[PDB]
């Protein structure tokens, strides 16, 4: 798992940028899917354009050879795309290129063979139809879950990238629907909103953590993925966000101690959509999106730049083995206020998703 530390740092860099920009909106994205897409894109770039991309993904190119970077991403893709995987994870990357470009066959082979991604030629002279073709590809790839992803295109577009991921979580230890009820969700310290709340009394990997000033709950999905939820104490959300580290997360994953608790966890149907040109530019990835871009691995003769780059991440969590409960007063742990969460792939320890729920009904 050579690249897992880098992906974790990229997750935190991206999260902290989005957390700073907006104070009251759900954050949800896939560090793995975004990094995979731009690692794939880097194969068509050279020189500063190439180096900016990998550095922006938190790889120090004076320390880690590029061969290890691509080997790590291909190993991660192998695990996620296992034919016998119960992880209901659908992800894809679509490259859309102007039909008038003479493309380099090596790049198209590398995209398809190494990164199992898709490249298409489109007539960007018809902006409305190119957008329809891009959005139809995503809609087909998600069986209708993601529709009309791209809302506008620049008239001078010759290259667009779409990265999507949809996860429908299945708990290893499910909830009972009979126990789900509407409950208050404290969006702030003096305001509440009613939302559907799953409930269960049982044995959980759960602990209060003084360093983070938060409850930390880990629950396993079917398919070798684990969710980690961070519930900040009153007035400690920003402290939690600042204090998070990869080492802190590794310690919790390694711990298997369990204890009884009365858990209240909201059902989640959340999405996040991001303009990666703007978001990744703030992380230092700029040349690939500009007229000076060195995309000569994609097209040798014509000028080229990436004009559009969109990420959408979609999550569904619901209620879908016998545990021994001691006869002592269990703590009541209610995720009825803003909380932070990650989803970790168990084999690689890589961060599949990171997010913050400020309002589940949003």
From Swiss-Prot:
Phosphoserine modification, residue list: 328
Note: The aberrant form is found in the plasma of chronic smokers, and persists after smoking is ceased. It can still be found ten years after smoking has ceased.
Family annotation (SUPFAM superfamilies): Serpins
GO MF annotation list: identical protein binding; protease binding; serine-type endopeptidase inhibitor activity
Protein purpose: Inhibitor of serine proteases. Its primary target is elastase, but it also has a moderate affinity for plasmin and thrombin. Irreversibly inhibits trypsin, chymotrypsin and plasminogen activator. The aberrant form inhibits insulin-induced NO synthesis in platelets, decreases coagulation time and has proteolytic activity against insulin and plasmin.
GO biological process, one term: blood coagulation
Effect in UniProt of substituting residue 125 to R: In V and M-Nichinan
UniProt-annotated stretches for the region RCL: 321-337
Protein name, as recorded: Alpha-1-antitrypsin
Gene designation: SERPINA1
Post-translational modifications reported in the UniProt record: N-glycosylated. Differential glycosylation produces a number of isoforms. N-linked glycan at Asn-60 is alternatively di-antennary, tri-antennary or tetra-antennary. The glycan at Asn-23 is di-antennary with trace amounts of tri-antennary. Glycan at Asn-224 is exclusively di-antennary. Structure of glycans at Asn-23 and Asn-224 is Hex5HexNAc4. The structure of the antennae is Neu5Ac(alpha1-6)Gal(beta1-4)GlcNAc attached to the core structure Man(alpha1-6)[Man(alpha1-3)]Man(beta1-4)GlcNAc(beta1-4)GlcNAc. Some antennae are fucosylated, which forms a Lewis-X determinant.
Comment on protein domains: The reactive center loop (RCL) extends out from the body of the protein and directs binding to the target protease. The protease cleaves the serpin at the reactive site within the RCL, establishing a covalent linkage between the carboxyl group of the serpin reactive site and the serine hydroxyl of the protease. The resulting inactive serpin-protease complex is highly stable.
Reported effect, residue 331 to T: In L-Offenbach
Documented effect of changing residue 92 to S: In QO-Newport
One Pfam family cited in the UniProt record for this chain: Serpin
Modified positions (S-cysteinyl cysteine) in chain numbering: 209
Disease link: Alpha-1-antitrypsin deficiency: A disorder whose most common manifestation is emphysema, which becomes evident by the third to fourth decade. A less common manifestation of the deficiency is liver disease, which occurs in children and adults, and may result in cirrhosis and liver failure. Environmental factors, particularly cigarette smoking, greatly increase the risk of emphysema at an earlier age.
Subcellular locations according to the entry: Secreted; Endoplasmic reticulum
Main location: secreted
Glycosites: 23, 60, 224
Family: Belongs to the serpin family.
Tissue: Ubiquitous. Expressed in leukocytes and plasma.
Lineage per the UniProt record: Eukaryota, Metazoa, Chordata, Craniata, Vertebrata
Site features described as Reactive bond, chain residue numbers: 327-328
Subunit: Interacts with CELA2A. Interacts with ERGIC3 and LMAN1/ERGIC53. Interacts with PRSS1/trypsin. Interacts with PRSS1/Trypsin. The variants S and Z interact with CANX and PDIA3.
Domain of life (superkingdom): Eukaryota
């Amino acid at each position: 798992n050579k690249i897992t530390p880098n992906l974790a740092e990229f997750a935190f860099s991206l999260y902290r940028q989005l957390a700073h920009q907006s104070n009251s909106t759900n954050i949800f994205f896939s560090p793995v899917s975004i990094a995979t897409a731009f690692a794939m894109l880097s194969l068509g770039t050279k020189a500063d354009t190439h180096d900016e991309i990998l550095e922006g993904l938190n790889f120090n190119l004076t320390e880690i050879p590029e061969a290890q970077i691509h080997e790590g991403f291909q190993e991660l893709l192998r695990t996620l795309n296992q034919p016998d995987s119960q992880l209901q994870l659908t992800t894809g990357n679509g490259l859309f290129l102007s039909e008038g470009l003479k493309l380099v066959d090596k790049f198209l082979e590398d995209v398809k063979k190494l990164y199992h991604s898709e490249a298409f030629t489109v007539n960007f002279g018809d902006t409305e139809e190119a957008k329809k073709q891009i959005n139809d590809y995503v809609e087909k790839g998600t069986q209708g879950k993601i529709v009309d992803l791209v809302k506008e295109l620049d008239r001078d577009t010759v290259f667009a990238l779409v990265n999507y991921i949809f996860f429908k979580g299945k708990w290893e230890r499910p909830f009972e629907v009979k126990d789900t009820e509407e409950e208050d969700f404290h969006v702030d310290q003096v305001t509440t909103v009613k939302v559907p709340m799953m409930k269960r009394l049982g044995m959980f990997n759960i602990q209060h953590c003084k360093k983070l000033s938060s409850w930390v709950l880990l629950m396993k999905f079917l398919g070798n993925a684990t969710a980690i939820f961070f519930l900040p104490d009153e007035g400690k959300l920003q402290h939690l966000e600042n204090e998070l580290t990869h080492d802190i997360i590794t310690k919790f994953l390694e711990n298997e101690d369990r204890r009884s608790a009365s858990l209240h966890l909201p059902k989640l149907s959340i999405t996040g959509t991001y303009d990666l040109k703007s978001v990744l530019g703030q992380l230092g990835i700029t040349k690939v999106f500009s007229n000076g871009a060195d995309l000569s691995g994609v097209t040798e003769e014509a000028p080229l730049k990436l004009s559009k780059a969109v990420h959408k991440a979609v999550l569904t969590i619901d209620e879908k083995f016998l545990e021994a409960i001691p006869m002592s007063i269990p703590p009541e742990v209610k995720f009825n206020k803003p909380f932070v969460f990650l989803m970790i792939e168990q084999n690689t320890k890589s961060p599949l998703f990171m997010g913050k729920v400020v309002n589940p009904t949003q």
